[PDB]
RNA sequence: CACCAUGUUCAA
RNA sequence: AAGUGUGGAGAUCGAAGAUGAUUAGAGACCAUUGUAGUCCACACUGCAAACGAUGACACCCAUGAAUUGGGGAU
RNA sequence: CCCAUCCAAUAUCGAGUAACAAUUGGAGGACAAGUCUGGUGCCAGCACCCGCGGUAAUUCCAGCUCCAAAAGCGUAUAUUA
């Protein structure tokens with residue numbers, strides 16, 4: 033089985049933390065990838081490998097070779113996560129990026145272009161995200177546009193739940209290591225921008241490790 | 253440190269751009285007349301010429317062959333050029349004093365990869381197509 | 395030279411001619427609808443693209459604007475008339491949700507398969523082009539004929555076809571001549 | 577009533593997040609330096625009650641060194657910590 | 665602080 | 677800075693050049709010299725890694741040692 | 751002329767190998783599709799670019815089989831994205 037070590041995974045396994053937005057609220061690091069596939073339903077969570085490319089290290093007597101694998105994960109309802117691990121065999125690094133992409137899961141705020149009539153089709157504001165030199169800019173699009181993006185950001189924006197978006201990219205996009213992680217940094221900024229919806233004062237809550245501190249001590 | 257605003261600064265911006273478009277090698281070639289007066293084709297495509305002599309041009313490193321090509325003298329302006337003959341064989345379809353229809357190949361007159369200093373290409377010899385002679389669709393007149 | 399008859403292009407080739415995702419979808423659309431070539435898909439792309447573009451312009455326009463009441467009630471009218479949208483869909487946001495198989499279901503090759511006049515969708519395209527289907531007692535020999543909603547009631551065999559009330563076709567008739575010389 | 581709505585008045589977004597009590601900065605999900613501090617409300621006899629005052633601070637504010645100036649400015653406003661001595 | 669110049673062409 | 681013109685100066689270092697030596701060769705480095713120059717006056721030149729490889733003028737901008745000139749408190 | 755209509759209205763010719771026969775460029779990558787077989791051996795040639803070829807060629811010359819668009823499809827030069 034899976035024995036947890038962190039207090040968050042003890043509360044996820046005990047069904048004391050019921051949803052994944054209860055972790056996102058208190059800025060908690062996940063630290064265990066079994067938290068994510070417990071909280072997200074198993075059929076409603078898709079993953080596929082973005083890129084696999086080899087990176088070499090010059091040694092005495094030849095080159096060392098390890099494969100760096102990129103994976104993206106997320107149900108298409110506002111959760112996205114991307115992880116990048118490396119390994120000697122190509123099968124190990126694909127498996128390690130699956131572990132890594134769930135730990136980096138993060139929410140996506142989605143909104144409307146014009147009037148509000150149903151589920152949000154687009155991101156709520158213009159947002160860019162930069163890794164290396166590659167910065168992608170994501171612009172809200174009208175209701176029936178579609179994702180207008182290069183096919184590496186387009187596959188990431190499909191898993192994030194965004195249905196209609198405009199996209200630019202400023203420099204050296206053929207480097208996919210930084211193109212992937214710049215679409216991730218831009219969708220991560222969608223809950224960073226303070227809009228006049230969120231101006232209102234909200235009443236403070238208690239941490240799941242604050243509230244359930246008596247239960248977590250009973251595991252010792 | 254780059255450019256000027258100002259609501260009445262358009263003459264500065266119009267002059268600034270018209271001089272910096274001359275640095276663009278596509279804008280400068282499309283707007284100067286050394287482009288066509290030195291082009292061996294008269295700013296056109298597929299110029300005819302007469303085969304003068306056969307040349308074997310050796311390939312550049314790291315390749316190693318000799319590329320079978322003819323030197324032709326164009327009819328429209330009497331300019332001697334060297335042009336490549338594409339396929340296995342095909343100098344057997346070209347003799348001297350043959351009229352050949354010569355296009356460029358590839359890269360707007362910039363010498364497609366292996367062949368040094370050859371930037372044109374035989375398309376049609378003795379008014380019958382040179383690739384039709386290779387595949388034996390039809391054969392040479394006379 | 396002084397001829398002013400007009401002509402334009404009805405299809406457009408895609409950017410990126412070798413996309414493995416796109417080439418697999420369009421071979422399904424050539425099989426599930428009995429199509430000759432990819433170009434018959436590509437005009438259904440441009441037909442629907444132009445509807446998806448005008449209806450996205452009209453939503454930039456406010457309601458109670460002159461170009462949205464007129465000409466937005468025209469694009470909802472031709473969707474309801476040709477079967478692109480059922481009568482509940484009246485809000486103009488449903489034109490932005492139309493797909494290429496929503497248009498391909500309205501071809502006369504598809505209804506003659508769906509009404510039951512032919513065994514397969516490749517049986518239907520033969521019988522249209524070989525002059526057997528009349529829409530309103532009008533022999534239609536065009537497979538890309540988009541059938542209206544009101545035309546669905548009246549699709550039948552042609553009255554001049556051998557399968558309808560016409561004279562027997564070739565293989566019976568050239569056999570009826572060979573039994574006549576004896 | 578916080579977060580965007582639908583024009584049908586259903587709360588559309590998941591996760592209305594916290595905001596820093598010093599800088600009004602919306603606390604993101606990966607901001608792992610962002611802390612909540614619960615201060616015990618205490619009674620007239622100097623023993624804690626069952627209620628606490630919780631204030632949450634963003635991660636960049638702790639990173640610079642300016643969190644401790646912010647905890648002072650909050651607890652003077654909440655009335656938790658006195659601003660000066662009384663007169664002798 | 666004497667002198668100590670050079671190693672053909674592709675490829676692995 | 678080198679360079680040029682006309683006058684001065686001409687100690688020292690010293691492009692050119694000359695002798696030694698090293699070297700396979702040495703037209704180089706090293707040693708001994710030595711012309712123009714170095715220095716001044718009046719003209720000319722306007723070629724620098726003329727650099728912070730960072731245009732000018734304003735604005736906002738957290739911290740702790742120092743430092744130069746002016747002013748003010750003790 | 752074409753198209754359209756027609757093979758009886760008393761009375762009109764006709765598909766089978768339907769021989770009435772689809773081609774043009776590709777199959778290492780971008781770029782969709784062969785670790786197939788024969789030949790040549792840095793030769794001949796290919797290759798827009800990267801590169802193939804030095805006696806076991808995923809790239810040449812061919813046979814097969816596939817891929818793409820299709821009554822079309824290559825190439826060259828201008829010109830817009």
Ligand SMILES: NC[C@@H]1O[C@H](O[C@H]2[C@@H](O)[C@H](O[C@@H]3[C@@H](O)[C@H](N)C[C@H](N)[C@H]3O[C@H]3O[C@H](CO)[C@@H](O)[C@H](O)[C@H]3N)O[C@@H]2CO)[C@H](N)[C@@H](O)[C@@H]1O
Nearest residue numbers: 357358359360407411775798819823824825826827828829
């Ligand atoms: N470097 C030479 C290049 O050759 C080109 O020349 C021509 C062709 O190489 C090229 O043909 C391409 C073909 O290669 C590619 N495989 C598919 C593409 N559809 C074709 O395009 C052509 O065919 C379609 C028909 O569908 C025409 O509608 C279209 O207008 C035409 N450009 O389209 C050009 C038109 O003849 C450019 N003219 C030239 O600028 C460029 O430099």
Ligand SMILES: [Mg+2]
Nearest residue numbers: 525554555560
């Ligand atoms: Mg008939």
Ligand SMILES: [Mg+2]
Nearest residue numbers: 669670671672
């Ligand atoms: Mg030598």
Ligand SMILES: [Mg+2]
Nearest residue numbers: 666697698706
């Ligand atoms: Mg010496």
Ligand SMILES: [Mg+2]
Nearest residue numbers: 689690709710
């Ligand atoms: Mg001396």
Ligand SMILES: [Mg+2]
Nearest residue numbers: 787788806807
């Ligand atoms: Mg072989």
Ligand SMILES: [Mg+2]
Nearest residue numbers: 777809811812
């Ligand atoms: Mg082959």
